[PDB]
Structure 1
Amino acid sequence: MEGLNLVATALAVGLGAIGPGVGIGIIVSGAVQAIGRNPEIENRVVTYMFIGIAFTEALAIFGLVIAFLIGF
């Protein structure tokens, strides 16, 4: 088919946004609630938040990679 390669990039980027987006949302919400409940642990909590975001962000990055493997 003439298309079907733009659709691939679209699907990859979109679903890589679908998953990690909610993942980061839940991570930040829970972490910030923990900050509010117990302020003096903030530092530790913050670190884990970022770590979690990384373990989530990479997934979206993978999707982007697929786009760069088709868009380019």
Structure 2
Amino acid sequence: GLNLVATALAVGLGAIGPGVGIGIIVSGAVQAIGRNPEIENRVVTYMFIGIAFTEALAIFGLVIAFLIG
């Protein structure tokens, strides 16, 4: 049953990084909005593309684990 450990390691190690990344993203976004309330329309765009790339990074490992499953 080594494939079970393989999937476990894939999913576990493909999320510890992206979670901190998303946290840093939206924390910086919230701080910037609080400092500069006027500029919100376009900064959220960069926040969300960063979120999308980080989520894609995590889902790469998730999909690899599902393939192994």
* Length-normalised TM-score, structure 1: 0.90
Q: How many residue pairs get matched?
A: 69
Moved over 6 A (4+): none
Give the structure with the larger helix fraction: 1
| Identity between Structure 1 and Structure 2 (%) | 100
Aligned equivalents of 1:62 and 1:20: distance in 2? 11
Aligned equivalents of 1:60 and 1:36: distance in 2? 29
Deviation for aligned residue 1:29: 0.3
Query: What is the SS of the residue equivalent to 1:39?
Result: coil
Structure 2 unmatched ranges of 5 or more: none
Deviation for aligned residue 1:44: 1.1
Question: Partner of 1:36 in structure 2?
Answer: 34
Cα-to-partner distance string for 1:18-60 (whole Å, 9 max, x where unaligned): 1100000000100110010001111111111101111111110
Aligned equivalents of 1:43 and 1:32: distance in 2? 13
